[PDB]
């Protein structure tokens, strides 16, 4: 196995110079070996990507999936971790910067079929990974407008050369 996500909170940066802007705090947390499909977990991890800590906790509190309660437990202890151990000031000034699932170590069982047949049943486990970053959630990228389309079109018209000549 690999446990690299747990070592990312051990990186120590050098003191910043007086002129540099404040580096945001980053808190990596995960929970290993959850009894849940990584594929189902994926949708909950996808849901909350880019949300404020509080938005993600709200959305998971009112989700019916089993994965929602586990991700909510992870988010809350990663939020506690942030202010207690990583020098974050406001517990709400956090957002989900990364949020994904991974395959866990799985077990194999026999599933009996009729006529002396059988399949092999995989008791499934997954990992949830979350990276919290200090600050407001980044604004969503605005939809491309007709102006930006036209600018890009004209730009492609202006970059075409005379092909296969001098």
């Amino acid at each position: 196995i690999s446990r690299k996500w747990e070592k990312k909170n051990k990186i120590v940066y050098p003191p910043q110079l007086p002129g540099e802007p404040r580096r945001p705090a980053e808190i990596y947390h995960c929970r290993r070996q959850i009894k849940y499909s990584k594929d189902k977990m994926w949708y909950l991890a996808k849901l909350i990507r880019g949300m404020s800590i509080d938005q993600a906790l709200a959305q998971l509190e009112f989700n019916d999936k089993k994965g929602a309660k586990i991700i909510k437990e992870v988010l809350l202890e990663a939020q506690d971790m942030a202010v207690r151990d990583h020098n974050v000031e406001f517990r709400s000034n956090l957002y989900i910067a990364e949020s994904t699932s991974g395959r866990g170590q799985c077990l194999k069982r026999i599933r009996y079929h009729g006529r002396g047949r059988f399949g092999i049943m995989e008791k499934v486990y997954c990992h949830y990974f979350v990276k919290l970053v200090e600050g407001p959630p980044p604004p969503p990228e605005p939809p491309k407008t007709a102006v930006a389309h036209a600018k890009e079109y004209i730009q492609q018209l202006r970059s075409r050369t005379i092909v296969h000549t001098l």
């Binding site: 940066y13 705090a25 020098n87």
Partner: peptide, 11 residues
């Protein structure tokens, strides 16, 4: 004495 945090910010 000046203590800085993990991210190099004066603490």
């Amino acid at each position: 004495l000046a203590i800085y945090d993990r991210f190099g910010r004066l603490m």
